[PDB]
Paper text:
The Integrator complex can terminate RNA polymerase II (Pol II) in the promoter-proximal region of genes. Here we present three cryo-EM structures of the complete Integrator: one bound to the PEC in the pre-termination state; one bound to Pol II in the post-termination state; and one of the complete, free complex in an inactive state. In brief, we mixed four purified subcomplexes; namely, a tetrameric subcomplex containing [name], [name], [name] and [name], hereafter called the tail module, the eight-subunit Integrator core, the cleavage module and [name].
SDS–PAGE and mass-spectrometry analyses showed that the Integrator–[name] complex and [name] bound to the stalled Pol II–[name]–Nuc complex to form a PEC–Nuc–Integrator–[name] complex, hereafter called the pre-termination complex. We obtained a cryo-EM reconstruction at an overall resolution of 4.1 Å. However, we observed a large additional density that emerges from the N terminus of the Integrator subunit [name] and runs around the Integrator cleavage module towards the upstream DNA. We used focus classification to improve this density and assigned it to the tail module ([name]–[name]–[name]–[name]). The structure of the pre-termination complex reveals the previously unresolved Integrator tail module, which is shaped like the tail of a scorpion, including a sting. The sting projects towards the upstream DNA and it is positioned by [name], the [name] vWA domain and the [name] cleavage module binding motif (CMBM)34. The tail module binds to the Integrator core and the cleavage module to position its sting and displace the [name] DNA clamp, and to interfere with upstream DNA. The observed Pol II active site is located four nucleotides (nt) upstream of our designated stall position, showing that Pol II backtracked after stalling and that the backtracked RNA was cleaved by TFIIS.
Residue numbers in the entry:
A (entry chain A): 530 to 769
B (entry chain w): 57 to 66, 74 to 105, 108 to 401, 405 to 566, 574 to 586
C (entry chain v): 4 to 36, 38 to 82, 86 to 180, 187 to 332, 338 to 388, 408 to 432, 438 to 455, 458 to 471, ...
D (entry chain A): 866 to 1102, 1117 to 1154
E (entry chain A): 1299 to 1484
F (entry chain E): 2 to 210
């Protein structure tokens, strides 16, 4: 399929998404600890993203250190809105959802499966294409080592609280379910009393089953939309 | 050359050989010869292609450069340009030449003379008209006369070319909201021009243009600080903040009426339409009562405006419209089915006009939501039967009914089955033919003519349309209607597949 | 300047430099005293203030109007309008300077190909004298009247016929000669010399060139004919195929003969065409010239001889291959010596009756390994066929069976044949050439060294 | 076990165990499947006006051409009739390539799989040489034309000066040559990327090296590779996947769901009733 | 009325770009026309192509044998490629065209439709040992013994059974010692 | 139906003219793209009893290379062609200098006719064709790439260039629809030009077996 067969997976992938966020700021000692899990590091500590009041580095700087040489990529994050590339702020992302690597530096964007997984055109793919295979081997190892050692600090879990929603969301779910059952009851009444007209190209059972399937599919879609819309950025299901 | 040949009584020797080339030789002799020869070969097209050959070579000239330093032009350029502007292709070309280099004294000075010399309708004057006062006023007079005699249909055609001229700046807008307001204030046809003024204001509202500050002072609604300050925040923000509604409620209810036209502003009532008739709008009891009171007050009272005094008020019809708006509010917000059970009174509310666009907008926000037709199972959805009743009871909403209905007709519902997609289109065509019986004839058939002759929609829908129309109508027929309908049946992609004989028999008698 | 219509300022108004008070070109007299009325003359004062770029403007408009004039000829080309348009072009095209062979070139391209009084005779004669650009009209009219295509093309064309005959007269040992499809070197120019009505032009010039070739060399007439004549009917022109009686037929027959040497079926068509009556005098002579004059016939004859020997191998007896080969050899031999008259040569009983057992002798003797009739057939037939058969036989009874035939052929001797370059190339420079000198055979001197 | 001994031989042809020819070139262009990337043809989608506007170099507008080029290059382009004629000939050549592409892909998808990623390569050349897009360039457009031409002469899939081998070579590298001419156009180099002479020479060298690396090597057991490539997704997954695959593979005189796809003529296809 | 072995036929306004008609306009753009198509159950390809108002150019079929009999070998090669690609793409994944092309070419390089079974693969002259390795080893070996068939040992499978270096990747060439190059040694 | 049969016969003739054009036979352009109304006006519109009978539709044409090589396109009355009718048609084949011909059958002919076809092969090359096969042109299908019959010299040049054997090429059946379309015999080679999404276009060759 002319795409990389192996990519960043599970713990490293979730933690590198949590790592490349715009809000991640690393203290000096944390930067020292992470920098030495880089086998390809030149030994020169980069200038911090923020100098004053306190020296703070960003995870983008550290991942720019991980990325080898001068590979260039543009990738789109999973949570990237489609309309963002049409209106203003198109190339200055308010969501940090446009990944662009320039001169082997992650100037912006949050990394996910679309930029580090098996998909063609990802960072590992172009890294292999432009820098042979051993450099990409070092790229894989450096990502895993640095990102896991930062995950020691950040940490990442999943629990009961991530599977729950507030009273408003559950009320909306129950109301949507109740309306769906009312619609199914109405369709059943129409079929039984013969107000329901069969659609062409199928029988009466097929028409009834297709309408019931449509109603329940709409119910599932609306409930899923409500549940996902109810999630928080700290939800671990959403993070995974 | 023609000029650089014998400069003196010879004069360069090389230029004397250059004189033999052109002079009154082939360059001049054969010009008349070939001008009569290409004519005799076939031809009035010869002079047209000749002018095209000249016109292409004209455009290379550097007109804005040399014309600035003269500052005089010998009195409006009588020697060469004044005879030139009387030529069609030249006067049209001058507009094109002006756009290349604006902000010049020479070009803006010269254009003021050609506008009143025969080019009353200055085409492609989007920016050039803005710079000059005389040309702008002249083309405004042409525009207002054209819209006045154009009737109703031309409003769609008259809006883009005219109203876009005020988009460059507001200084071209408030002046373009001044004289026709004076024409509107008079009782001699003052409604239609205020109609196009409010239409321009609404286009301004949907193009981001700020029209909330000028239209209030123009309808002398600035006479009271409270009224103007209250309405300003509503139209600028675009929401129903409670403070302005409360002051308006306690103001207009007292024995001191504001100008009636300020509460009748179409942008304000469309804002009420959007705020209230949306299904997802949740309001408390008290503010809802004030909202329905304002709409009822804005649609019930007859007032005599004597410019200093007014003594007139109606309360009963205000109460009836308040009840109708409140009941439709309850139906719209409850949403649950029991929808079918509520048509006993809902059609009674349909009879009231102020409710008709409310349920129309509610239907628009309902049907446009995807999977609604997928979720629907009836042969005819109840919402479309409501639009049938709306078409029956009233005729002012017919452009809006047709706009919503063609918006539905052009829509693709990919989630639906293909046969139910066609049956949905046939349902929309049933609304077309219903509206055809309610007087909206020419725009609907114009839509069909566009959809068939130009677009590549399904021919079965057109055939169903023509069959239903011929089966529902009877002679006599007007000449414009047969002029529009007859090319449909002559397309021959419909005629051979199935009233038809009666129509073709009558049409030839008609024309 | 203005050498047509009238004269206002094309000559005396051409020279503005003469004496002290003779100034006056025509840049002030021309137009004033543009195109037509003021409405369209108003661009002149406005453009004259822009540094007077009048020459490029006038010549550009003239160029665009001349190109647009050329296109409208297609309207009348697809003729009352054509006559008037041609007359207007002729009146406007009588002057120099303007219409640089575009107007008269267009008119001659429409209907002025063949010579006409005041249209093609005078215009064609002047264009030929001045070397004009009306190449199609010039070629068609010169070829029609024998002025340029027939007359001025008769020098290089008549000499090119002999030069082409010498060009394929080589006696090497024949290096994959090209077919009629690949024989289009100068074919486009020669076939397009009479694009208009080259049936008569080819009759006088090309026909006269062929008659001069027959009075010049044996190879000259056939060499030029073989290339162009076959390919012209492939040009998709009705006149080119219909000019000859069976040019479209015999040209395709020759091309398919060279495509497939062994052509038993094609021999029936060839015998039907060459064995007919009611057109013997002119048609028979022309068929003999086109059949034996061309070098491709000589190259075909070796394959025909080998195929005849192979066919006689199966039968192993002697009395259609022999009859066809003898008919072709007799027609070729009689074409060079005999004129284009009825009662064509060849068809002798001795040659045809002897060559069949002579060809069968290879088949009979070869099988017995593990004939006077050949000598009689060789003596009865032409020497060129014997030379070709002996050369082809070079490449064990097979080598001794075709021996007497070729030996008697060479001994008897001859007519127009291809047994030199074709013969020797089948199987001190004088040392090798001594044996070949008797045959003419050509492989001894040029074939041995060049091979 | 069917295509087990199917291997690409040293004459670049794919043959089975008994040397019967399966393919004259392995992918029909002799390229291995791992050094090949998804790419977009910038010529198939746009309209005629858009294609002319975005791909035809204009040597008549002195102002904008002086904006995007150094003044000496402006003078050289304007003065030379030969350079302008060559640029127009290149434009007509890419127009022929455009109509060839439209013939090849009647469906308007510009996504193709080609060895050298030209857009990323141009971006790399820009970044390495510190190209300033604001400044005018020092790159002669005729240098771009001759560099592209020589590069096309350098990318060889079929060796041989005979007409048959030359025709096969032109046919095997047709799509990549079209893509190369479209991407490395004089107009595009001038306006969109603004490369320099050293950067352009590096880009040409990089394209040649990468295309040469992407050729399928002799000795690859492409039969086994193809079998595994078609087998692994099958293991991963009106007829659903695996039984339909079995019906395609085991050539069945009766399938479970035989079907036609009847396409109608235009007049009937627009009408539902006569459909 | 109609055509035999054609049970049911369904009209469809396709939403997929592959089946929708696409025509270049005068302006040079691509316009997708939502025109009616028909899908049938049961195949009588020839009759349908011969029928009226039916586009013969674009009318294809799911079936593989009959399209080979009707349209030819290159047509069934292309149709099989299209069908295989459709199967792979329905999964949503992607497989490079080279492997599909190689499968189609291998199973259509002998004129007939070489089924990938005992019935197609073992009828070719690939050699007795490769065929015995594949399937019905005893039948193939006894037939070879009867007919004196010789295995030229040019395939990988035969050399694998005999333990010899295959003609595969690292064994598709020989190595010769460059004796002249050894003269620079020390 | 009368009009239905007239249309079917017109389509048969249209496909035959396209066939003769593809095989390299001199066909007039007007008859190559004649309309159905042109056919009806020319031939009589009434195959049931009127003039356009099958024998009135017989087509003769000669090869562009040699006028001697002519192909005959026959149209028998009976659906099932027996020995007697092919015999008299072959007598007509004898009396002219023609070499090869065609037969268009509405229904499958008797097997003995096919055996007679097989045995008379060296003297003359006659080919049958079911009416359903010729009812639509086959070369215009999207699935069918263009097929070009290549000459003996071209095949020898190919074989020498690739340095391969005759048997090492891909194969096409003699009874293949396109092989029958081009009327190519055993040992003939046809080159196939198809466009590929990987290389732009691709050339393949197929020997006939």
């Amino acid at each position: 399929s002319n795409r990389p067969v192996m990519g960043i997976v599970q713990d490293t992938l979730t933690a590198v998404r949590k790592f490349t966020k715009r809000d991640v700021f690393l203290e000096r000692g944390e930067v020292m600890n992470l920098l030495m899990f880089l086998s390809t590091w030149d030994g020169k500590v980069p200038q911090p993203a923020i100098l004053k009041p306190r020296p703070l580095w960003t995870g983008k700087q550290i991942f720019s250190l991980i990325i080898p040489g001068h590979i260039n990529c543009i990738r789109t994050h999973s949570t990237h809105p489609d309309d963002e590339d049409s209106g203003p702020y198109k190339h200055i992302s308010p969501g940090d959802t446009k990944v662009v690597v320039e001169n082997g530096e992650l100037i912006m964007g949050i990394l996910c499966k679309k930029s580090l997984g098996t998909s063609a055109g990802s960072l590992v793919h172009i890294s292999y294409l432009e820098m042979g295979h051993d450099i990409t081997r070092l790229f894989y190892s450096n990502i895993q080592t640095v990102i896991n050692n930062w995950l020691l600090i950040e940490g990442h879990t999943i629990g009961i609280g991530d599977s729950i929603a507030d009273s408003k969301t559950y009320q909306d779910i129950q109301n949507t379910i109740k309306k769906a059952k009312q619609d199914v009851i109405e369709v059943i009444e129409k079929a039984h009393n013969n107000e329901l007209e069969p659609t062409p190209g199928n029988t009466l059972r097929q028409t009834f089953e297709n309408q019931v399937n449509r109603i329940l599919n709409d119910a599932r879609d609306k409930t899923g939309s409500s549940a996902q819309k109810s999630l928080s950025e700290y939800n671990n299901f959403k993070s995974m | 050359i023609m000029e650089p040949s014998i400069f003196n009584t010879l004069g360069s020797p090389e230029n004397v050989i250059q004189l033999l080339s052109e002079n009154y030789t082939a360059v001049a002799q054969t010009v008349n010869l070939l001008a009569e020869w290409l004519i005799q070969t076939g031809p009035v097209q010869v002079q047209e292609t000749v002018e095209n050959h000249l016109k292409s070579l004209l455009i290379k000239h550097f007109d804005p450069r040399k014309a600035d330093s003269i500052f005089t032009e010998e009195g409006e350029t009588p020697a060469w340009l004044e005879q030139m502007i009387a030529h069609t292709t030249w006067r049209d070309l001058f507009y094109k030449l002006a756009e290349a280099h604006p902000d010049c004294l020479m070009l803006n000075f010269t254009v003021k003379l050609i506008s009143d010399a025969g080019y009353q309708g200055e085409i492609t004057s989007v920016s050039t008209a803005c710079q000059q006062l005389e040309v702008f006023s002249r083309v405004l007079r042409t525009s207002l006369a054209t819209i006045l005699d154009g009737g109703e249909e031309n409003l769609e055609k008259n809006l883009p070319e005219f109203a876009k001229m005020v988009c460059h700046g507001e200084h071209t807008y408030l002046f373009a909201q001044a004289m026709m307001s004076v024409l509107a204030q008079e009782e001699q046809g003052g409604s239609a021009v205020r109609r196009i003024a409010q239409e321009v204001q609404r286009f301004a509202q949907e193009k981001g243009h700020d029209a909330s500050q000028i239209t209030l002072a123009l309808g002398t609604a600035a006479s009271y600080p409270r009224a103007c300050q209250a309405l300003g925040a509503m139209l600028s923000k675009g929401a129903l903040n409670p403070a302005d509604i409360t002051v308006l409620f306690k103001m207009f209810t007292s024995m001191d009426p504001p100008p009636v036209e300020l509460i009748r502003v179409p942008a304000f009532l469309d804002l009420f339409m959007q705020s209230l008739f949306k299904p997802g709008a949740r309001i408390n009891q008290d503010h809802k009562h004030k909202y329905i009171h304002i709409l009822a007050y804005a649609a019930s009272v007859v007032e005599t405006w004597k410019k200093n005094k007014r003594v007139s008020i109606n309360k009963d019809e205000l109460k009836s419209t308040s009840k109708a708006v409140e009941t439709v509010h309850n139906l719209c917000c409850n949403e649950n089915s029991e929808l079918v059970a509520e048509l006993s009174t809902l059609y009674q509310c349909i009879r009231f006009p102020v409710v008709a666009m409310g349920v129309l907008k509610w239907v628009d926000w309902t049907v446009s939501e995807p999977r609604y037709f997928q979720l629907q199972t009836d042969h005819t959805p109840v919402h479309l039967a409501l639009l049938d009743e709306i078409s029956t009871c009233h005729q002012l909403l017919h452009p809006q009914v047709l706009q919503l209905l063609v918006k539905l007709f052009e829509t693709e519902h990919s989630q639906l089955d293909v046969m139910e997609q066609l049956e949905l289109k046939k349902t929309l065509l049933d609304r077309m033919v219903h509206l055809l019986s309610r007087g909206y004839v020419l725009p609907v058939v114009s839509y069909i003519r566009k959809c068939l002759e130009k677009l590549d929609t399904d021919i079965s829908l057109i055939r169903y349309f023509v069959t239903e129309v011929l089966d529902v109508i009877a002679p006599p027929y007007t000449s414009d209607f047969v002029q529009l309908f007859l090319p449909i049946l002559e397309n021959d992609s419909i005629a051979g597949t199935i009233p038809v004989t009666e129509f073709i028999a009558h049409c030839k008698s008609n024309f | 300047x203005x050498x047509x219509x009238x004269x206002x300022x094309x000559x005396x108004x051409x020279x503005x430099x003469x004496x002290x008070x003779x100034x006056x070109x025509x840049x002030x007299x021309x137009x004033x005293x543009g195109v037509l009325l003021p409405s369209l003359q108003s661009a002149l004062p406005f453009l004259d203030l822009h540094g007077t770029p009048r020459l490029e403007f006038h010549q550009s408009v003239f160029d665009e109007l001349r190109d647009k004039l050329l296109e409208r000829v297609s309207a009348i080309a697809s003729a009352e309008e054509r006559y008037k348009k041609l007359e207007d072009l002729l009146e406007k095209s009588f002057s120099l300077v303007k219409m640089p062979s575009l107007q008269p070139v267009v008119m001659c391209v429409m209907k002025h190909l063949p010579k006409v009084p005041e249209k093609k005779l005078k215009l064609v004669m002047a264009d030929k004298e001045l070397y004009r650009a009306c190449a199609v009209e010039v070629k068609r009219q010169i070829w029609q009247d024998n002025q340029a295509l027939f007359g001025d093309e008769v020098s290089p064309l008549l000499k090119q016929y002999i030069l082409e005959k010498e060009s394929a007269l080589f006696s090497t040992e024949f290096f994959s000669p090209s077919p009629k499809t690949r024989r289009q070197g100068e074919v486009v120019q020669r076939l397009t010399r009479m694009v208009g009505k080259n049936v008569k032009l080819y009759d006088m010039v090309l026909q006269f060139l062929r008659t001069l070739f027959l009075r010049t060399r044996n190879v000259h007439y056939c060499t030029l004919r073989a290339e162009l004549l076959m390919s012209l009917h492939d040009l998709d022109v009705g006149e080119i195929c219909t000019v000859d009686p069976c040019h479209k037929f015999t040209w395709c027959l020759d091309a398919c003969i060279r495509e497939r040497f062994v052509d038993s079926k094609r021999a029936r068509e060839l015998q039907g065409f060459l064995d007919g009556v009611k057109k013997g005098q002119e048609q028979v002579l022309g068929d003999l010239s086109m059949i034996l004059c061309d070098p491709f016939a000589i190259n075909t004859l070796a394959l025909s001889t080998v195929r005849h020997l192979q066919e006689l191998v199966g039968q192993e007896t002697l009395p259609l291959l022999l009859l066809l080969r003898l008919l072709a050899l007799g027609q070729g031999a009689w074409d060079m010596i005999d004129s284009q008259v009825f009662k064509e040569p060849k068809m002798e009983v001795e040659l045809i009756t002897r060559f069949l057992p002579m060809l069968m002798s290879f088949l009979v003797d070869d099988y017995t390994f593990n004939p006077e009739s050949f000598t009689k057939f060789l003596q009865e037939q032409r020497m060129a066929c014997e030379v070709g058969l002996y050369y082809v036989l070079h490449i064990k009874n097979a080598l001794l069976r075709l021996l007497p035939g070729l030996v008697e052929t060479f001994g008897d001797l001859g007519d127009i044949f291809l047994h030199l370059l074709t013969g020797n190339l089948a199987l001190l420079e004088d040392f090798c050439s001594s044996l070949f000198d008797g045959f003419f055979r050509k492989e001894n001197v040029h074939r041995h060294a060049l091979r | 076990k069917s295509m087990e001994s199917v291997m690409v031989k040293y004459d670049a042809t794919v043959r089975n165990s008994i040397n019967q020819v399966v393919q004259l070139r392995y992918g029909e262009d002799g390229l291995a499947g791992e050094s090949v990337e998804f790419q977009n043809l910038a010529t198939l989608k746009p309209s005629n006006k858009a294609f002319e506007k975005k791909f035809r170099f204009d040597y008549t507008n002195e102002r904008a051409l002086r904006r995007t080029l150094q003044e000496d290059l402006v003078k050289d382009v304007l003065s030379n009739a030969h350079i302008q004629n060559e640029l127009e000939r290149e434009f007509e050549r890419m127009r022929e390539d455009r109509e060839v592409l439209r013939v090849i892909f009647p469906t308007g998808d510009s996504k193709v799989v080609l060895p050298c990623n030209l857009l990323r390569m141009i971006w790399n050349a820009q970044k390495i040489f510190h190209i300033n897009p604001r400044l005018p360039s020092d790159l002669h457009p005729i240098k771009v034309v001759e560099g592209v031409k020589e590069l096309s002469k350098k990318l060889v899939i079929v060796n041989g000066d005979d007409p048959l081998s030359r025709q096969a070579q032109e046919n095997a590298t047709l799509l990549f040559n079209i893509h190369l001419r479209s991407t490395l156009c004089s107009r595009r180099m001038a306006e969109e990327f603004r490369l320099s002479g050293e950067a352009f020479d590096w880009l040409l060298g990089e394209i040649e090296s990468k295309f040469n690396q992407a050729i399928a090597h002799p000795g690859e057991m492409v039969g086994a590779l193809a079998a595994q490539s078609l087998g692994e997704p099958a293991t991963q997954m009106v007829t659903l996947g695996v039984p339909r695959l079995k019906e395609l593979i085991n050539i069945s005189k009766k399938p479970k769901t035989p079907s036609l796809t009847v396409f109608l003529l235009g007049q009937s296809a627009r009408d539902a009733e006569r459909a | 009325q109609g055509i035999e072995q054609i049970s049911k036929v369904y009209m469809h306004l396709p939403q997929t770009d592959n089946k929708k008609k696409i025509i270049i306009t005068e302006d040079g753009e691509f316009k997708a026309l939502q025109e009616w198509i028909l899908e049938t159950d049961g195949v009588s390809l020839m009759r349908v192509l011969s029928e009226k108002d039916v586009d013969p150019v674009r009318t294809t079929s799911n079936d593989i044998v009959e399209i080979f009999t009707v349209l030819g070998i290159e047509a069934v090669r292309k149709a099989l490629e299209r069908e295989l690609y459709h199967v792979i793409s329905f999964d949503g994944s992607y497989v490079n065209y080279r492997h599909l092309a190689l499968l189609c070419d291998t199973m259509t390089c002998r004129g007939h439709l070489m089924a990938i079974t005992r019935h197609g693969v073992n009828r070719q002259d690939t050699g007795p040992l490769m065929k015995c390795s594949f399937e019905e080893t005893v039948d193939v070996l006894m037939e070879a013994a009867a007919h004196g068939e010789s295995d030229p040992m040019k395939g990988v499978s035969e050399n694998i059974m005999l333990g010899q270096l295959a003609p595969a990747g690292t064994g598709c060439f020989d190595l010769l010692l460059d004796a002249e190059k050894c003269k620079y040694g020390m | 139906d009368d009009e239905e049969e007239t249309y079917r016969l017109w389509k048969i003739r249209k496909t035959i003219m396209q066939l003769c054009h593809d095989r390299g036979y001199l066909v007039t352009q007007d008859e190559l793209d004649q309309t159905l109304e042109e056919f009806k006006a020319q031939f009589g519109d009434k195959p049931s009893e009127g003039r356009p009978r099958r024998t009135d539709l017989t087509v003769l044409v000669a090869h562009n290379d040699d006028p001697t090589d002519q192909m005959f396109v026959f149209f028998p009355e009976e659906p099932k062609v027996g020995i007697k009718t092919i015999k008299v048609y072959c007598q007509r084949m004898q009396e002219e200098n023609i070499t090869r011909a065609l037969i268009v059958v509405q229904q499958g002919m008797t097997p003995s006719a096919k055996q007679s076809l097989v045995d008379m092969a060296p003297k003359y090359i006659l080919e049958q064709f079911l009416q359903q096969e010729l009812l639509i042109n086959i070369t215009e299908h999207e699935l069918v790439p263009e097929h070009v019959v290549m000459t003996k010299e071209e095949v020898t040049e190919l074989l020498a260039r690739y340095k391969l054997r005759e048997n090492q090429l891909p194969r096409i059946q003699a009874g293949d629809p396109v092989a029958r379309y081009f009327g190519i015999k055993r040992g003939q080679v046809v080159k196939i030009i198809r466009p590929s999404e990987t290389a732009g276009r691709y050339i393949t060759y197929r020997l006939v077996q």
